[PDB]
Homo-oligomer: A and B are copies of this chain.
Amino acid sequence: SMNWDDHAIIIFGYPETIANSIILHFANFGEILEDFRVIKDQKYPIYTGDGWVKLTYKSELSKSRALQENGIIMNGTLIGCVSYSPAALKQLAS
């Protein structure tokens, strides 16, 4: 029961049609602790809403790499990637 929030990111800005593709893309940077069904091959429940998702990596090395993806284009749309903070999550619409 420790806190891995510093290993977490929020990905945002995408249409929900590419939500699964988003998870697969960011799974390429490390092992994700949430049990997302598309990658099914202490618990980390899923925080997600329309156009955003929180993901937690096992390694901080992975989080730092994922952050470099802020502003990539997937299916013609700009994808946002920021470091997780509770302050941001509290404000998000679902």
Neighbouring B residues of A52 by C-beta, 8 Å? 78
- A12 CB within 8 Å of chain B: yes
B73 touching A70 by the CB < 8 A rule?
no
Copy number in the complex reads 2
A78 touching B82 by the CB < 8 A rule?
yes
Neighbouring B residues of A93 by C-beta, 8 Å? 75-77
Task: Classify chain A's interface size.
Answer: 20 to 34
- A30 CB within 8 Å of chain B: no
Nearest CB of B to A80, in Å: 4
Neighbouring B residues of A79 by C-beta, 8 Å? 80
- A38 CB within 8 Å of chain B: no
Q: In the assembly, what is the distance between CA of A71 and CA of B73, in Å?
A: 16
- Within 23-73 of A, Cβ neighbours of B (below 8 Å) are at 51-52, 70-71, 73
Residues of A within 8 A of B (CB): 10, 12-13, 51-52, 70-71, 73, 75-80, 82-83, 88, 91-93
